[PDB]
Design a protein around this nucleic acid. Structure first.
Lengths: 58, 149
RNA sequence: GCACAAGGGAGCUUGACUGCGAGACCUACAAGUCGAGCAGGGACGAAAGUCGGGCUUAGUGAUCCGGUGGUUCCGCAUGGA
RNA sequence: GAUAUUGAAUGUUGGUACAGCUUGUACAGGAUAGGUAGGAGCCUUGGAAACCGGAGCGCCAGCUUCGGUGGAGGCAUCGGUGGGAUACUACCCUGGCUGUAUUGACCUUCUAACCCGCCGCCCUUAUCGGGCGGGGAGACAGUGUCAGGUGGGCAGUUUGACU
RNA sequence: AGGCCCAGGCGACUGUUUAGCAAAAACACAGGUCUCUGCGAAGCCGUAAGGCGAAGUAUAGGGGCUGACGCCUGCCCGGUG
RNA sequence: CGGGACCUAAGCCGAGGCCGAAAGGCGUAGGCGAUGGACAACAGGUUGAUAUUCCUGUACCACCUCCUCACCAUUUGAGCA
RNA sequence: AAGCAGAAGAUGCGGAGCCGCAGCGAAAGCGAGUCUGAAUAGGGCGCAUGAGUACGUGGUCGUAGACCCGAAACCAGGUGAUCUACCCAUGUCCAGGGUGAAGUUCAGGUAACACUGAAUGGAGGCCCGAACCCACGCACGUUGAAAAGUGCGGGGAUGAGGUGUGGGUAGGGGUGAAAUGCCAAUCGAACCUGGAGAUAGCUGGUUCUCUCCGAAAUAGCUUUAGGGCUAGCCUCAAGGUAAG
RNA sequence: GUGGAUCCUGAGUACGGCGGAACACGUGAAAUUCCGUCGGAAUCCGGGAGGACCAUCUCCCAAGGCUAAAUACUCCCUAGU
RNA sequence: GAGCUGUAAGCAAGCUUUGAUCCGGAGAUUUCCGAAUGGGGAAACCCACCACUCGUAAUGGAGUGGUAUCCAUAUCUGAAUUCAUAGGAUAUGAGAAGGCAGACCCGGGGAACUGAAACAUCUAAGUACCCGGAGGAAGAGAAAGCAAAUGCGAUUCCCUGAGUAGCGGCGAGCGAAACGGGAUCAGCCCAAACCAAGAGGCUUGCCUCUUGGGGUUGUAGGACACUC
């Protein structure tokens, strides 16, 4: 699960409950499968909401 | 989100009303296929350009229209006798085409569709007034000279 | 242990005080206990002089953290916080 | 659940200023006594009650703002009415609504996202996926972040001493 | 190359299990019952792609309980689910 | 004769691809994979060790043509598949 | 000191830095005084009763595996389904003898149908019993022929059957007609390497000699009772010196 | 090197909310850096830091890159201790 | 420059002053597996296609060289729908892969035992271990800094600061930095402004893209007018 415009991907962090008990978890970026250009060729590929926010081509 | 309207789309607006509309309604609707362009985009400049161009053009055109409303004014007396007979009676038929004919008497031509006279003109010979009505934006000052045959 | 009141009654009063404290008891440590005497202001009584809570021994707990009041303390370049 | 992907539209709906609100009801009682910055104050033909009545305001008093038989009609504490009877700044609405930009839910739509372990063609001697077209759903779901509930399915631990 | 007979518990029966102490009254069983699931069924493995379920479709699959057959399976929904 | 240059089952691998922190998991085309399918030699002799393999007589299978004869037409095309 | 020269040396340079010569207070701050406090009162703290520093040996402590041997067990990464459990694909085995189902033909029977009797028929997780498989009883064996057998009897033996070959399921798992069964003679959580010299308030052991002195098994507190800290008791040294 | 009308000096970036991680620093007064989601600036009269935070002052110009020596380590080779 | 065909002791034998054996530098051969790469596979094997040679009357057989995938460039083609793109075809590439030194450096992922005399915050420890990536060293780097003074001027490493300031069920424990003294010493290049052109869409510069001038700066600098 990558983003083809930026290096966004899953990263690991620790879930901490009350009493601060530590449990390992994961953090996923907000990817979306969407139909866009990569070269002049169009394509369907992953992209993040943040990346889409900066007005990219569909 | 702001985008050039491009065309007229109901509430959307009319060509030229580039506005900041919500995404999707734009990128995923209006922009795709439909009229659109995003005012925020550099195209905004192209827009301004073409728009100003056309506007200035047309305005100056109407201005020169009032200009020739004056142009044809100093005109030499229109000497198109309308077959004046039995005094005021005029065998000749006076109407707007009649006026424009009295007109092309040296060369210049006009369009009979510009006359301004509600009532038909009484078939007289007097100072037949002819308020040239080329366009709403500019009428004109004139009074052709009917004559006797 | 107390009828020379420490038991009972009346009037006044808030020492059921602040700063302390020579010495001593008890003690592994932590703590616990008594303490004359000094100063500031009192209460009682004319005065002497007594009063630093119950007639003596139980009625009560560490540190950390947090709350509240006073602070002539510190407060990260300086003034504030 | 909130938010991003994620919106169009009508109707039901919080605001911001535009037109303004009236007797602005103490047992009593001329009408229904909230701002006495002139309380001793004018108006300038132009029609009054008006078969009967007002969008409106009282456990049916009427009011002033006007309506299908209305051309001069008139309170101010003082004939039988008291505290400041508030009668020609422009009051805060006594809190009322209309036409105007914004917010939530129910509605239906579609392109238009997103989805399709539905169909036709091609990539292609391919039941993978992917390009088009059609069709069905549909701003939902799925997925990302956060939040609450449930949760021996799973994990780390505790469960005292004398005797 | 069968000892047999009479009775009684338990289990209907053939079968299966603690290799290497225990072969049974334990497990299974066909039968019965309750409950879930309208099909990208539910349930399950996996993170997810993928699958099994099933190239199956409530006369089918999953789960709980009881266990041929015969007669039956009463009352209580206060509590927990 | 058994197995190869013949075939495929389960399963495995797997170009593109789908998914996944990375390694990798999955899987289409396609390939691998006998324990199966198809497939022409057998009965006597022989030494110390081998024998349907070596020798003896008879066979059969696939393919090839320096060659031989019988036939068809060398585009109203014979033959091949 | 680092560092620079210097036979991996000594020595030279290197004054950054560190400990004392002043302490009191939380601190501002003051200073042989200072803190408390209204106090020039009292009391606490080193006053006044001035040696520390650098290095070496030795005792002991602290962090390091710390004195040496020993756990059951935990976690990370891999290797195993040639045994065994289950499953998939494809082959193969089961001497012999009994019982006699369902249907079907004939005859009778009936209006027709039911039905009745023969003949045929050949079904069964059917019966008896070899191969094969299982392991119920007894004996022997028990430093055995054998790390689970042998001898004589037993049970199934056409089925939910036995069995060959090729494959799949891998341990915070897999399989399980369900015993905590099996997963390479190991299973209430396999095996191999690493963290790892895990930790062990527990058990064992700890090596040459002589001399001086020489205990305790008690109090208090302790998730404390066979452990530990302080006190008592022992020893060595420097002082007070005559307290005992 | 003088002048300083006008222009440029790194945007979904800094920074903030939410939940995490690294800073010796465990959410604490918590500065500073980075990650995932969402929100989201200014352009020299401008911006960031000086351990919350504000003001004055001091220092500095992020959101673009390259940059040797001092430093770390021996499967090796050569000569030695 | 004189014994030598090793280990090893053989005579059946032969080479050596026409310079051996031996030692060093550079070359050639280097079977078959192995990233293994023509295809397959159970390592050390089996069967191919194409080009050219050996060989047969031909079939059979042999020798040499190519034939994996992905990525880059170029060319041809460019379905559906034949604008056009995937897709397909050909050619050119000392291109990648895989190994390694059980070391070192970056990162991505990330334990428990144990200490706390139990135990969950914490510790062990961002250690062990797994994964990716290059280097001979790597990371770091020329200030949106350190610091508060008649101030210093890239990073890195050594002593010192200091077991201090701090953090911490304020427990167990963890724990710096700057000033100072040393080794070493390198500072540079861009984007932006504007100029030039060529870049066409025109909606006459709003964007091209390649160069150069234009430039790398904080008591501001550069574009822009005045200087080699």
């Amino acid at each position: 699960r990558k983003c083809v415009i930026t290096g966004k991907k899953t990263t690991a962090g620790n879930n901490r409950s009350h009493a601060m008990n530590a449990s390992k978890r994961t953090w996923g970026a907000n990817l979306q499968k969407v139909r866009i250009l990569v070269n002049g060729k169009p394509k369907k590929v992953y992209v993040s909401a943040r990346a889409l926010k900066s007005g990219k081509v569909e | 989100m702001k985008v050039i309207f491009l065309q007229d789309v109901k509430g959307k607006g009319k060509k030229g009303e580039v506005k900041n509309v919500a995404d999707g309604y734009a990128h995923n609707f209006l922009i795709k296929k439909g009229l659109a362009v995003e005012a925020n985009a550099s195209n905004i400049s192209a827009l301004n350009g073409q728009k100003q161009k056309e506007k200035k053009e047309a305005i100056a055109e109407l201005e020169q229209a009032k200009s020739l409303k004056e142009t044809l004014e100093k005109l030499t007396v229109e000497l198109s006798a309308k077959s004046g007979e039995g005094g005021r009676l005029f065998g000749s038929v006076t109407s707007k085409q009649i006026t424009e004919q009295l007109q092309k008497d040296h060369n210049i031509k006009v369009d009979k569709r510009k006359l301004e006279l509600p009532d038909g003109i009484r078939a007289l010979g007097y100072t037949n007034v002819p308020v040239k009505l080329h366009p709403e934006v500019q009428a004109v000052l004139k009074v052709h000279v009917k004559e006797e045959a």
